[PDB]
Every structure is written in C-alpha cells, then in structure tokens.
C-alpha cells in the first residue's frame, strides 16, 4: 500500500502522429554548449549550430513536449524534426519569419 | 517519437487506462478520457513548451485565459478526465487543450502574455466543497474549512451565544446585517440562514428581505407544525430554502405529523439519520420522499468503534444514494474541517464491506467516487439554489478549485483557489531560497487579502434583499450572487443520489430495513486519512 | 531577544519535533508529519553545531529507518529541506530519500 | 409547584438572599432584588421556554429585542440584582423580565423571531471597563485590555517612540489624524489625548479641532504653571478634559503652586498617590479638592511585598472613596490587562484589614463592591465626558457588556460583548464537535471583524472636530460619539467616591495622615486572582 | 562648561572623530561631521531639554515638524554625519539642528506642541532598503522584509503558482489589477513587473496600462531576441524599466547575441554573476556596458564554504563597484530577509581580504560603507525610476527610515518607520509595566494598521496607468506615486558603483579576469551577522 | 484553560528557552537570543516557586557565565527584564549585568 | 571584539562657547528638595530658591544639555549661568516675561 500510487498500464505512446518529419545532421561549431527545446523553431536556433536551415523551416524537434536536446561544443548528430501545425505562423525567436509559413 | 507509458505518466501525469489510488484508501480511479493531443502537451519551466511563439501566443488579454492549470486529472460528478483547465475573469472558461493556435493543433484554451500557469501534472483537481450546516460560533471556522477544501459555507449564527451553539440561525434583521458585513472579511463564499421558528409570516419575510438565503427550523426554537407550515409558505413565495431539524421529543406529534405539516413541499432535512436530531428515532424514513433533500453530518461518518443501528444504516444509505448530502454541523455535533475527509472514509468502508456498486463499470471505483464527491459539491449547491454560481467544474462557474497530490487526496490540499486566485496553500520557510523548506504549514495568500479577497468571494443574497438594495445600504464590498430555484429541486435532481427506498424503522429495536432486508454495517477499528497524516 | 518572524517560525518546527521525539521514545512507528519534524530539527541542530552541509546531507538519511515509521511514510517523503544559520550564514540542506 | 432554593439556584442562578463569592477573594455579594416572576423564567434549549408561541412571541423585529441575556446577576454601581437584559440596536434596551406577552405575565423585554439568546444564568454581568491612562505604545494593547474586560481606552501616543513611552500624548494634527484612522482597526472604543504642554492657546486649539477629547499635561514636556494655565483655559472653552502628571522635581514650585495655577478648575490628576509621578511627595493632598478627579494606577495596587508610606495610604484612600478612579498607565509604569484585577485585590485586602465599611448594610460586601466597580466603569466615564454613551448598564447606553463565571470574576471573562456583538471570548478546538474541547484560549469573534467592528465601536471626538467634519475628511468608518460635560464634573459627582478628606503628608517622614490619624496598611504576601489562574 | 568626549558620547552619541564598529564585523565608520552646536543638543525626558518654552517652541503645527529624531548618526550614500532629522507630512523635512528658535541658536528643525520625539542618540539611522527582485509567492514576505529594514519591494507574481515560483512576473491585466488591490494590505511600498516575454507590442502595452512599472523578461517564458527587442521598444515609449534574466541554454544565441538584441538600450540585468540565471557562463561580461544596470542576489553573497569561479568574482566586482545593486530573488534562489545582511557580509569579507579601497580616506571604512549601502537603497531606486520618492535620506523624500543600535546593525532593527509612522519594531510583554520585558519580538505597529497604513505607503504606477485612472477604477486606498526616468539611467548614474571594467570569462575554465588580472576570493568559514544573533 | 494573549506570549519565551537549554547541555557557547531566553525563563520559574523579587535579582546573575556564551554576548545584554505572576500578583524582575 | 563598540577619541568638549555667563549663589529655603533643568529660565525657578532673580534674567544653567542641578532643603551653592540665545524671547515657565528679553 502506497498512498496515491499509480497503476500505469504497460505499453507506449506514439507522439505527434500523422505529421511530416525530416532528419537533419547538426554540428555545433561553438565553444559553449547549446540546448534546444521541443517547441523551438529549429530554423532560428543559435547561429553556431550549422545545418540546412532551409529544410528545417517551420519545423521543431520531434521529442516529448518539454524535453530538449543538448549539443556539446564540436558535437555532430542527426536529429528528427516534426512540422509545426495550427496556423503554421511563426512569431518570435530570432525574428526571421514573423508571419505564416 | 515514442515514449513508454510509465515515463509519460511521470512527466505529464497518468493517461487513459491508468489507475490512481486515492490517498491511503482502497478506492481506485481510472482516467476515462484525456483531451490532449499526444506530443503537444503544454509544460512550464526552463526550456519547456510555454514560451513566446511556442506554447504561448501573441493574442491580447481578451483573447487568452488568465490562468491555466496544465495536465490536470479532474474528478467531478460528470467524469474523471485528464485535461488543461482555463480560467478567465475568475470563472471557469474551458476544460480542454491549452496552447498556442499558431503552432499547435486542437488548441481550445489559448495561452498568451497575460496567462499565469499552475502546473497540475500529477495532481487531482476538484471543485470547492460546500458545507450547508454551519453554526457561526467563531470566525476561525472559515479558515479551518478553507484548508480542508471547502470553499462555500452556508449556515447561521452570531458568534458564541447559546442560540448559535444550538442552532444554525442568525436571528433577525440587525444580526443578519451584522453578519453580512462581517462576511466580507472571510475567504469563503457565504450565505446566511435566519430563524424560521415563528407562526407569523411577516416575521420571516423581514429576515429574507434583510439578506438570508434560507430559514432554519430547529427544535430548540420549537419545531411545531404551525412554525413548519409558516416557514414553508414564505419559502414558497420568496424562493429560499428551508432547513429542518425536527422535533426529537415527539412533543407536537411523531415524524408522520411533521411530514404531514411539510405537505410535500421542498425541504432540506438535517441529520436525516437521527443521531444529531430529529424525531426519535424514525426521522430516517424521510429519505423515501420526493420533496426531501437529505443530509448526514460527519461525527457519525463512518460507523467506527468509538462513535447504533441507525448509525450503521446511514453509511449504507449513503452508499446507495438514499442520502444526498454530507455536512458538518460545525461545533455543535460536527467537525468543520472533516466533511470531505469523512465522506471518503465512508466510501472506503463501504467498498471494503459491500464491494462494487451495481452501477460500477470496469475494474475501478469511478462510479462510487462520482456519487460521493457529488454529496459535498453539486448536490449542496442545488439544494440551496446556488448551483448556477458554484458546485462543480463547469464553464461559466466561479473558479473555486482545489488541487490535490494523490497521496494527500481528501486530507491536505496542495492549492486552494478562490474565484481565480490562490487563497491558501502549504508554504515553507518565508526566508528560504525556495518555498519548500520546513516548516511547511497553511498560510493565507493574496486571494485572502483585503480588496483582492472581496473580488474573489461571493455573498449570496435572497432575491428580495438584492432588489431592496441591501448590498448598497450595508456597503458590502464583496461580489454578490442571488439564489434561485430552491422550491423546484427534488430528490430526483440530486446527482447520483436520487434513491427513494422503501425504508422502515422498528420503533422498539431501532433496526432499519430497506424492502424488508436488514441494513447494517460493522464499526471500523482503523480508517484511512487518519493517523498517517495528522500530528495530533 | 528581538525574534524575527523566521525565528519564531522555526520554533514551530522545534516544538513539532519535540512531539515526534517523545513518540519514537515510546516505541511508536512515526507518521508523515512526525518524521519530517524529527529529521528537520536534527539538521537545524547540526548547523548550530557547525557541521557542514555535506555531512548533514548524509547524516539526515540515518535518523529514521523504514521499520520505525508507518507504512507508506517513506514514499511520502522523497526529500527533506530545511535552512538554518551555519557559522557562515544561512544554508539550504536537502536530504534525498531520508528514510530507507 | 414548589422547588427548593438550591435546585432553583442550580437551574436559574441565585436569587434574593443568596450570597456569591467573587473568584477566590473574601468578598461576598448578595442578590438584593430579582425582577423575575417565579415559574416564568425564560430558558433556552431543547424543550425549554424560548420557543415559538411559548417564551418567544409573534412580534416583528421592531417590537422585540435583538439580544436577550437571560437570568443575569448584574453587579453595577446602582445595584446587585438578578434580571434579564434586553439589547436592541446595539444599545441597552431594558433590564427586566423577558418573554412572550401573549402567555407570560410582567414581560418587559419581548422575545421574538429576531431575538438571539445568551444564557447568563449562573453568571455575573458587568459594564465594560474604561481605562483613561493609555500610552499607545503598541496596538496589541487593545486586545490585552479587551480580554480583561475593558471596552473603552482613552490615552495618547503614536507607537513605540520616546515621547509616547514617557507620556500619554498624541502630538499634533498629523499624528492625531493618523491615530484616528488607525483606531477603526481596533475592537475597543477610543478617544485620544493631545500634548497639552504649551503656553500658546492656538497650538492647543488646533489639536482639539483635529480630534482629541482631552489634553495631557505631562512633566516630561514641562508641567509649568504657564503651560497648566494655558491648557485649562482652552479646556474651559472647548469642553474637553485635562489630565495632569505634575512636576516631580519641584522645579517651578511645589504642589501648592501647581494647585494655585489650576485655579479651582476641573482636572483629572494621574497617579495622585505619587509613585508614578507628581510633586514629590505630597501630590496626594490633591484628593481633598472639589475640582480634582483623582486616579491611581495598578502597579501600586495593592501594597504587596515586592512592590512605601504613600503606597500603603493609597489602598486606604481608595477604600474610603478619596481616590475615585483606577487606571493602568500602560507600558509606562502600569499593566494594561490588570486594571480590573488589581482593583479587586485592593478591595479584598481592605476587607481583610479594615473590615466592613461604615456604609455597609447586611452581612455582605455589596457596598464595597459598588464603590470599587464604579472606579473603573462610571467614574472614568464621567471624568472624560463620555458617560452619556458608556460607563454602566443603564438603558440607552452602548451595550458594552462583560459576562463572568463567579469562579473567574475579575480575571478571565466568559464573554466580552461590544456594542451588541460578542467581540472576544474563550474558544476551544475549532475543528471539534463542540466549542469546549481544549485548547481553550481567547480568540477574536465577529464583533471584531471589519465592518461589523466599525458598527460596534465608537471613536470619541471633541465637539469642535465633530463640527469641522473631521470624520468625513479622515473617512473614519466607525460610529462617532462626541464628548461633553468635562468642565462641570467635580469630586462630588464621583459615584460612591466623593470623599474630600483633610489629608496631610510629612515632607520628611512621608507619612500620610487623615484628620491627624495615621493612614497605613500592611503589604500582602499572597493575593487572590493570582497564581491560581495564570500559566505564567 | 566642559565635558569629556567619553561622557559626551554616552549622553548624546558619538561625535566628529569617533569611530563605531558595525555589528560584529571589521567595518568601522567615523563621524565626518556633526551639525549640532555643543551645549544645545535637544534631549527628551524628565527635566530634559524638550519642554515648553525651552527646547519646545510656541509655533503652530504648520511651523514645526511632526516628528524629530534627535542626535542621529546618519549613514547614507552622501555622508556619515551626526544630526537631528525632521519629518513633516510623512516626508523628510530637514537634516540639521532641532530646537526652539526663541532660546536656542542655529535651529533649523523647529519643535513645537505638535512634535513627537524619537530618541536616536547612540543609534545609526538609514534609509529603507529597496528590493527589486521579488517573487510574490506569498504575502508573508513583506513582513519578513520589513523587519530586516527593506521598505520597498518591486517584483511580480500572483501567489504560489508555477509561473511565479520561477519568474518575477504578474501575467496580464486581471492579475495585475488583483495584485494592485492586494497591495493596499501590505506595509511596504510596492511596484509590479508584468510578463515581458512576447513579440507583439500591444500585449505589453496593455500590461503597462494596467499598472506595472516594469516588464520582466525571464528565460522560462522564452528570453528570445524577438521578445527582448519587443519589450525594450515598449519600455522606451512608456518610460518603464525592463528586467532581464537571460537565456541560459544558449538556445537562441550566446550572450553577445542577447547584448546585440538589447541594442544599447537601458536594462537591468538580474543575477549578472550567472549562478541564478543568465547565458552560461559569461553573462557577467554585461557589467562592462554603459546601458546595463547590474545586480547580484543574496544566496551567493558572500562566497562561503557551503554555497565556483564566478561566485568568487562576484564579491570582488561588488567591492570594485562593477555590480551596482544587491537583491534577493525571494523564494526562488534568494532570501527575502537577508539582502541587507548579506551586503555587509561581503563588505566585511572584502575588507578582510583586499584591504582598503583606492578611494578610502582616513583610517576608517567610510567609503566602502557608502558604496555598499548605495547598492540596496539609492541605486535600486534610480534603476526603477522611483528615486524621486524613496531611496535615500534627502529632503522631500518619503520618510522610510530605519533605526539601528550599533551592535545589531544590518541584522535586527530597533525601529522601522514607514512614511512618518513606526510600522514594526521589537516589542516586549504587552501586559508589562514597561515595553522592554521579555519576550521581545517584532510586532506590527500603528503604521501597519488599516487606513493609517494606506496613508503611509505608496503603490507605484506607470505613467499610463495613472493617466487612465487605474487607481480610481480599482478603488486603491493607498497613496500613489508614478515612475519616471527609467530609460535615461545608465551605469554612470549608479552612485559609487559606475565601474565598467574590461572583464573577460574563459568559456572552458570559467575564470573571470579584469584587465588580464585574475579575479578571485576565498570562501569564508565563519561570517559576522550570523550565529551570534539568530536563534535558528 | 482560557489562556489570554500574555500567557500565550510567555509560552514563546518558554519554548525559546527549551532550545537554549538543550544547546548548553551539548556544551555549546550560547548566543544572544539563547542567553536571554534561558535566563528569562529561569526567573519566571522562580516566581512560580514563590521566590522574592530580591532573591531572583541575585540568582539571575549566576545562570550563565562569560565562559559559557559567545564573545560579545555579555556586553549585548546590560540587563534582563521579565514579569511573572508571584503569589502576590505580577512583578517586574530586573537583573543587571546577568553575565559576568 | 564587541559588537557596535565605540572608539571615542580622547579629549574634551567645550560647551556654550562664546556666550555671556554669570555665577550666582543660590540657597534653597524650602523643606523639600528642588531640581532645575539645563534649559529652564533660572529667574523663574521655584520661589523657595533665594537668589538675585534680577541678574539671572534671560539666563539658564551652564551645564550639559539634559542634565540638572539639585538643591537639598537648606542647601546653598554657587551655580554658573549662560545667556539664552535665538530670539531671546521667553514664553512659559512661571509666566513672568512671556515675550522678548
């Protein structure tokens, strides 16, 4: 007996199903580490991260909401992105779009 | 991508199919529905979802909620579901999927620059309780009740005086006006009951016109057929409720004479079980009538070793839905901070003894949980004509919410929200670098301060008092709500508690029977929500 | 003495712990609030003695054991935090899983 | 039928002829009269008299009292009688026989649907005390005083500052206005004293116009003949009282010079005994003058082992009625919560040492009790011109009442009523099924909350301030009362304390003599109302 | 005549040349000037100077101060001098020589019948502290802060909610209005910060129009270049301040990108050291910029054994004046009651380790004391545009003063004055014959009560909110002050803390260097103002 | 019990002293608030016992010595005052230079 | 180390310098002691003190502010007075001047 204990049924959850995704190799060319969040507009991340910014347009990390991916200085890795939805209007970040698309 | 269910539950709280134990009881609930879109859950914190252009939009204040409770496990009379709760203007705006429509799908609760966040992932959220059996013996009672999760208190009194010690009555215009003014200082919604024991109509009309939302007929002031009939006549014309505590001495007649005086008119019976008052000893038979809205108090809930026949029956009649409300009878045979706590103890004992209810579906206690939570939330609200303002988590209603950690459900709240602002909550060392260091104890918050309090609480008035401009004359500072629909409610309207059983009592042996079958239960030696949580 | 609100507040903790302490002495299995009060006050006195944060973070895990508290209690307390005046000002002591 | 006197006393309290011991003192009171009609006493509870059609009538609110104190044993300067007390509109309506005129005889206090009940059978009821020697050093003093049974506090100060620590003065218009605003937050009636030490009239007039009901002339600000004369001149034109704490150093002259400066004008002398201030050491001779209204403080009451000639004399001069008032001199040589307590300790010690007073009739201490209770109730009220509002239990007066259980008389009150509502009272466990379980301690009630408080308390203003609209300008929320008759009161007006003895002091030996006879008393080693009641 | 210097110091406090140790630290101050005229010092008490015709004049209220602090040792950014302080209308009237012009020479602060007295001989008097990094997690924080000597609190929050736990933001119009109303109940000056994390200008303008005096940009809501630029644009047009807690994850760029987004515009950087937030780990380089007004929090002040490179550097950068403000970051990585206390601990440690500052003159620590006191008084006031109302002891400013006994300087205040009235102070037994008997602890005074409180505190509004009539609409009861000059302040304006050093950080080793020289300090094992003063 | 505010207030002093008492037992040199609490409670119990003001004014100076408190503490306490109910009512006890 | 300790530099302070002073023999002819404060108008002290009231006109005791001089019954002593300043207007005391001089 454990007060307020959970009895989670076993299995897995598929996230962001039914959405366009794409993989991208990203290399951190900076001297300081960089961490990107799940819903950040990938095409507007820290300029020190070198990758095909054009392909990542309107995409975000395909990871559980609230988590993040870290890139140590000089690190290189392939990440998977998932397309934004809703109105697909980007406002904020580095201010590169500030409108739909 | 993909995430396991266990990791998912630890991150966003349990989802459809997962079961959660309520405190240290044997009751288990199962998430029936989840309104989220997997992978699009809003979460707050460094690098999380709720940030500019991401989970937070660009909309102006008018187009987004003021407060959002993320990933909440709702337990209400209508369902046990997982969802985000939106609060706007101090009222429940929506129950759905919060976020930014610019990048997220299915967003029904928009989050913008003006949105505050309360993280409810892993917590259970419920409506604020409503106690309709309060003796205003001391003002310290409102805090005790608020801390337990009760956000509305209906009752009567003028302080520690003989009349108030014995009955829930605020005698007359002067004291009524005085208590209405004093109410502005209290962090809970309030509605007063006047002295309904009189055989002259005008003496009652004056009280209703002064501000009371009901009339309490108590035997100490003389619960005679003449007084009962007089109070019900006025109730019928002013749309206010009548609360009865019948003649225990059988001085003017037996229970059948009382019921006859009532004449099939709507009435709320106090201690329908008998213990704390009522025609000795078959007042309990009232729960078979359509016009009777019955309640039991907490000092008898549940039948334990130190608390006999009617006491054992009460717990069962509650489990069957024959008794619709649970109240306290504060400081005059009941405990103000234990109404919610005791309701679940009874539910536990009944699960243990009687097993699953005939209405239960699935391997959970979901139905029994909905039937019991309705007893101290929606049903009290319908009985007193305030269900349009409070009583449940439904849109348009006052945001009186209570957040609970599963291990402390029903016992000690994590957050108590009144009309949109946190009123009281556990708080650690004030000088600490974080709010969690010991000693942690309940302390008043901004929702309980001066003008903010007034704006987040309601003083209920009768329609007459409202029309007469009582609020402007007394210079009441809090928001006002009017009661309505007290005469049209009946047993059948009591959510999940509309049973009218063929119940009988033996004048001699005091045994209670339903359809000839004997009703009874065994006294418990050890109960949950007890020694494991309290210091004293 | 010129006691500030925080000092007076810690007096509540000290007294809460006095209750717990006596009950443990009688041989009772402690409940949730008794356990927190007892371990919290222990740390406060450790700082008064001049022990370091590091030492206390360890010693705090050996005040009570699983067999001395009520069932479920160990899991209701994933950590215990308390601040006290050390010789070098106020410090935050966090004891993880104090009861094992 | 017939009932024995013992059974009768246990049921309705003592009647004519019965004696009651006051706490653990040697003082005994005897019921002089009983206004009831035997067999028609009103009593509240299940199956009792106060019920619809029986002890409770059918009259509308306007024709019945709001609150009724049943079977009370009144102890007031005018008598020690048994009666029901009726309270209406926050004021004392009547002292007589409560009930329903429809079935009971001799009913003068009608009880109807709008009537609340306080059971006072077996209890002693008195007026609220009045302390006129308050240093407003801290606001926490009003609660301490309220708990002891003092409902009105007159004095001055601005908080813990050097000027206030030493004197009872609220310096000037700004601080006066500030203290008037702060007063709305306190549960006692309040009236301020300004700094009367100045030789320019306009500087005093401004203060009176700002709101003070008196001027305190204290030696620390310079109690010179010029200042004294100036304050008394303004007092005479504005109808406010002057409180003096004379020049102890004999710097400007001796006591005879002070008295000469006073010029036979009305004045209240602080610490007339000398200990806490006044011309060393014959200020005590002032009690022989017609225009002098003398008081003594509590730290010297009574002459005990750890507290010399003047201290011994003081107790006797009180017993003889030469000293008319007892006050505290709060936190500057006196105890705010011990004014009442110490008054009775002196009365006890004097009974023990000097026996019965020359005015005593019967085998009781009734006269000595009336003489001493007048010292902290009616006399302070007459001295400061507020006797039209408070000071005693008389009809038309503000209902500031104190209920006491005989065993705790003078020490710990059962109920403290302010303007018609209970303001503070002992209260047990808030979560208990009854209000009596431990821990029982004093807690604020509804009469002490926000707007209800304002309506049940009075802020006394000088006639000028009232005319100038000070209340409307400062936006004061509490009720207002104006002072009057401060210049026309004299020693002969002091109820049961009008003795002007031929008293002399020896400049060297400090011995006090009355008509050549030496006045003195012995220090007590053990007093009543002490270690038997207090935890610390 | 003649008196020795020691006897003189014991009687009137120290004079020119005398040194005084601050609590138990190694810091020593020396009286630089004394504004008195030897032999003409005003002193209060029996037979002292402040009495009618002597040290007290005949002038009307309009021509004399309301309160006078006699013989005070002032410690302010402009000097450490001895003088009398005059307070009139709740504002600092003059700093000079108090007395009666009729008989005394050089009187600049006239004392009359309307003058209250606070004896400050032997005490040190300072301005009230200003904390600009408050998380409104609970209302109990204002008392904790008031007791420590902080009289103004700027920050944001709505209570114990996730958003407030993490950031100093009051999200939107509704919560802003709610917090403004709740502020009337608190005994400190208050100004709110809204959520500045948005890329749509109108969403920010609404908040400023609702009442916030600033916008907090915190990384948890997304501190992106787009949001930063948007908040600074609106700040520039509405004359409000922006408080930044930069992107620690380097998600949108490094510190240089943040600085670039700022575009040389005025901004207050939170935790410029890095520990509690900011671009990991070179946010510290910001202190080299002219438009940056930097602050450090208290949990890192000073670098001790249990608290690394940046932490050691912070203490030095403070000693050099590169960091201009010290704040708390209440209950979210900082201690609300320790901002002042920790500022002096750093000063002590720096004296001990680095010796005298290059600016020091004489054998005292006067300059280091002025540089450090400015950090929590005047500089925070200039940074937020409220320096016209509070921040220092200068004429025309709100009289928010703190009185300290030298042995308890920086730790436990003798008196805390708000707008002219004592708000809180140590107070002994309420029932005692004097206010000094134990138990002595801090208790609220008259300056903290209802209407008196409102009159002695200020709610700061943005110019827009003020124009829109927000105060009249919300029905705010306290006095109002408007902010101005937040955009024109720069590093050079920070009193005694305008250093812009050529500072560098090593991305790998995290070492801080100033002009190539390595900056560092050793962790202390024992600090002053610690175990010798606190019970826990 | 009907505890008034003053009785409840003295409970704060009693508890403060309980803390001091235990620390002294451990052999710690007491600080400012601990010293005041300890000597103050001593006097309160003296009055409860029925000792005279005069006796206590003397006994109060022998509770703690200079070697039992922290440096500077003796000078931070020029006197200690406390009131308690003696057999003959409340009295004020003042102990001058309690620590020597 | 003593918290908040003073370090008073040695020496003396000369009081009321630059002002007219005069000595006066004063004898207390009263039965009760008399104490006079530093700023009290000497010419208006207790009538029981016998001295040249005329010479003491507009003078006060030349002693440290706040202190006083006591005169036991039958005592005789010589005190030193210092002239009032400011406007030299006397108001209050026994009310003998109530104006300038």
Swiss-Prot record, chains A, G:
Activity at various pH: Optimum pH is 7.75.
Swiss-Prot/TrEMBL keywords: Cytoplasm, Hydrolase
GO biological process: urea catabolic process
Molecular function per GO: urease activity
Protein name in UniProt: Urease subunit beta
Record NCBIfam families: PRK13203.1, urease_beta
Hydrolase found in the keyword field: yes
InterPro entries xref list: Urease_beta-like, Urease_betasu_sf, Urease_subunit
Its EC number(s): 3.5.1.5
Gene name of this polypeptide: ureB
Sequence similarity: Belongs to the urease beta subunit family.
Modes of activity regulation: The apoenzyme can be activated in vitro in the presence of nickel ions and carbon dioxide, which promotes carboxylation of 'Lys-217' of the UreC (alpha) subunit.
Catalytic activity: urea + 2 H2O + H(+) = hydrogencarbonate + 2 NH4(+)
Pfam families: Urease_beta (PF00699)
Consequence when changing residue 39 to A: Reduces activity by 20% and reduces thermal stability above 50 degrees Celsius
SUPFAM superfamilies: Urease, beta-subunit
Pathway this chain belongs to: Nitrogen metabolism; urea degradation; CO(2) and NH(3) from urea (urease route): step 1/1
Originating species: Klebsiella aerogenes (Enterobacter aerogenes)
Assembly information from the UniProt record: Heterotrimer of UreA (gamma), UreB (beta) and UreC (alpha) subunits. Three heterotrimers associate to form the active enzyme. The apoenzyme interacts with an accessory complex composed of UreD, UreF and UreG, which is required for the assembly of the nickel containing metallocenter of UreC. The UreE protein may also play a direct role as a metallochaperone in nickel transfer to the urease apoprotein.
GO CC annotation, single: urease complex
Compartments (UniProt record): Cytoplasm
Keyword Hydrolase carried by entry: yes
From Swiss-Prot, chains B, D, E:
PTM note: Carboxylation allows a single lysine to coordinate two nickel ions.
Outcome of mutating residue 220 to A: Reduces activity 1000-fold and increases KM 10-fold
Example of a GO MF term: nickel cation binding
Domain (Urease) ranges: 128-536
Keyword RNA-binding: no
Binding site residues for substrate: 218
Annotated effect of mutating residue 218 to A: Reduces activity 500-fold and increases KM 1000-fold. Resistant to inactivation by diethylpyrocarbonate and iodoacetamide
Cofactor note: Binds 2 nickel ions per subunit.
Gene Ontology biological process terms in this record: urea catabolic process
UniProt cofactor(s): Ni cation
InterPro entries: Amidohydro-rel, Metal-dep_hydrolase_composite, Metal_Hydrolase, Urease_alpha_N_dom, Urease_alpha_subunit, Urease_AS, Urease_asu, Urease_asu_c
Recorded metabolic or biological pathway in which this protein acts: Nitrogen metabolism; urea degradation; CO(2) and NH(3) from urea (urease route): step 1/1
Family membership noted in the UniProt record: Belongs to the metallo-dependent hydrolases superfamily. Urease alpha subunit family.
Protein name: Urease subunit alpha
Organism ancestry: Bacteria, Pseudomonadati, Pseudomonadota, Gammaproteobacteria, Enterobacterales
Swiss-Prot record, chains C, F:
Name of the featured protein: Urease subunit gamma
pH dependence: Optimum pH is 7.75.
Domain of life: Bacteria
GO cellular component: cytoplasm
One GO molecular-function entry: nickel cation binding
Species for this entry: Klebsiella aerogenes
Quaternary data: Heterotrimer of UreA (gamma), UreB (beta) and UreC (alpha) subunits. Three heterotrimers associate to form the active enzyme. The apoenzyme interacts with an accessory complex composed of UreD, UreF and UreG, which is required for the assembly of the nickel containing metallocenter of UreC. The UreE protein may also play a direct role as a metallochaperone in nickel transfer to the urease apoprotein.
InterPro entries: Urease_gamma, Urease_gamma/gamma-beta_su, Urease_gamma_sf, Urease_subunit
Xref: Pfam families: Urease_gamma (PF00547)
């Amino acid at each position: 007996m454990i007060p307020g204990e959970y009895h989670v049924k076993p299995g897995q959850i598929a996230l962001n199903t039914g959405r366009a995704t794409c993989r991208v190799v990203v290399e951190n060319h900076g001297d300081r580490p960089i961490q990107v969040g799940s819903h950040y507009h990938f095409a507007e991340v820290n300029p020190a991260l070198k990758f095909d910014r054009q392909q990542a347009a309107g995409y975000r990390l395909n990871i559980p909401a609230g988590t993040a991916v870290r890139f140590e200085p000089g690190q290189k890795r392939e990440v998977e992105l998932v397309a934004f939805a809703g109105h697909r209007a980007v406002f904020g970040f580095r201010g590169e779009v500030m409108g739909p698309l | 991508s993909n995430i396991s269910r266990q990791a998912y539950a630890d991150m966003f709280g349990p989802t459809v199919g997962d079961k959660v134990r309520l405190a240290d009881t044997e009751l288990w609930i199962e998430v029936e529905d989840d309104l989220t879109t997997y992978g699009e859950e809003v979460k707050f914190g460094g690098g999380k979802v709720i940030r500019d252009g991401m989970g937070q939009g660009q909309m102006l204040a008018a187009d987004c909620v003021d407060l959002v409770l993320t990933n909440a496990l709702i337990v209400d009379h209508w369902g046990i579901v997982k969802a985000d709760i939106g609060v706007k203007d101090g009222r429940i705006f929506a129950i759905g999927k919060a976020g930014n429509p610019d990048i997220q799908p299915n967003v029904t609760i928009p989050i913008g620059a003006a949105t505050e966040v309360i993280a409810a992932e892993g917590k259970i959220v419920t409506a604020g309780g409503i106690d309709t059996h309060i003796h205003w013996i001391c003002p310290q009672q409102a805090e005790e009740a608020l801390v337990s999760g009760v956000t509305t208190m209906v009752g009567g009194g003028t302080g520690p005086a003989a009349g108030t010690h014995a009955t829930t009555c605020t005698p007359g215009p002067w004291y009524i006006s005085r208590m209405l003014q004093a109410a502005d200082s209290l962090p809970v919604n309030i509605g007063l009951l006047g002295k309904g024991n009189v055989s002259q109509p005008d003496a009652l009309r004056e009280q209703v016109a002064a501000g009371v939302i009901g009339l309490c007929i108590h035997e100490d002031w003389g619960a005679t057929p003449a007084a009962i009939d007089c109070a019900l006549t006025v109730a019928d014309e002013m749309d206010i409720q009548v609360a009865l505590h019948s003649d225990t001495l059988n001085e003017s007649g037996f229970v059948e004479d009382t019921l006859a005086a009532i004449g099939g008119r709507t009435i709320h019976t106090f201690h329908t079980e008998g213990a704390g008052g009522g025609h000795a000893p078959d007042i309990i038979t009232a729960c078979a009538h359509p016009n009777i809205l019955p309640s039991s108090t907490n000092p008898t809930l549940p039948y334990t070793l130190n608390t006999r026949e009617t006491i054992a029956a009460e717990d069962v009649l509650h489990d069957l839905g024959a008794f619709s409300l649970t109240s306290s009878d504060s400081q005059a045979m009941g405990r103000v901070g234990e109404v919610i706590l005791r309701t679940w103890q009874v539910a536990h004992r009944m699960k243990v003894q009687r097993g699953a209810l005939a209405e239960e579906t699935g391997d959970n206690d979901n139905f029994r949980v909905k039937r019991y939570i309705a007893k101290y939330t929606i049903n009290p609200a319908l009985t007193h004509g305030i269900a349009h303002e409070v009583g449940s988590i439904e849109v348009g209603k006052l945001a009186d919410l209570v957040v609970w950690s599963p291990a402390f459900f029903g016992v000690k709240p994590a957050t108590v929200i009144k009309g949109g602002m946190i009123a009281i909550a556990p708080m650690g060392d004030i000088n600490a670098s974080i709010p969690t260091p010991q000693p942690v104890h309940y302390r008043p918050m901004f929702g309980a301060l001066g003008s903010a309090r007034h704006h987040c609480r309601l003083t209920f008035l009768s329609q007459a008092a409202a029309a007469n401009g009582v609020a402007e004359r007394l210079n009441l500072r809090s928001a006002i709500a009017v009661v309505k629909g007290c005469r049209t409610v009946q047993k059948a309207d009591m959510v999940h508690n509309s049973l009218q059983p063929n119940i009988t009592v033996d004048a001699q042996t005091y045994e209670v029977r339903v359809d000839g079958e004997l009703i009874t239960s065994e006294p418990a030696d050890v109960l949950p929500m007890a020694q494991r949580y309290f210091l004293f | 003495m010129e006691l500030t609100p925080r000092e007076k507040d810690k007096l509540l903790l000290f007294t809460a712990a006095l209750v717990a302490e006596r009950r443990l002495a009688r041989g009772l299995k402690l409940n949730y609030p008794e356990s927190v009060a007892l371990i919290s006050a222990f740390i406060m006195e450790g700082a008064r003695d001049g022990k370091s944060v590091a030492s206390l973070m360890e010693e705090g895990r050996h005040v009570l054991t699983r067999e001395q508290v009520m069932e479920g209690v160990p899991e209701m307390i994933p950590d215990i935090q308390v601040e006290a005046t050390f010789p070098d000002g106020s410090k935050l002591v966090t004891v993880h899983n104090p009861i094992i």
